[PDB]
Amino acid sequence: ELETARKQQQSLQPVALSWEKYQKQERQLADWLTLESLLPLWFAQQASH
């Protein structure tokens, strides 16, 4: 029983790391997409000035 519990923990460990990496990637991509949407207005203000 103890051996199988430890084996299950070992097998599950990489999944959490991959999920954390995926969260990082997703939020970085979301930030860059938001900046893509916001790009026109910065240049518009600088052009106005």
Please, could you describe this protein's structure?
With 49 residues, the chain is mostly helical. It contains one helix and no strands. The chain has one helix at 2-48. The chain is rod-shaped, with a radius of gyration of 22 Å.
**C-alpha termini separation:** 71 Å
Approximately what portion of the residues adopt beta-strand conformation? under 5%
The total beta strand count reads 0
Helix segment count? 1
- Rounded to the nearest angstrom, the radius of gyration is 22 Å
Please outline the major beta sheet.
none
Helix fraction by DSSP (H/I, runs of at least 4): over 70%
The sequence of SSEs as H and E is H
Q: Determine the structural class based on helices, strands and strand pairing.
A: mainly alpha
Basic shape: rod-shaped
Please write out the topology.
Elements: H1 2-48
Give a brief description:
With 49 residues, this protein is mainly alpha-helical. It has 1 helix and no strands. It is classed as dna binding protein.
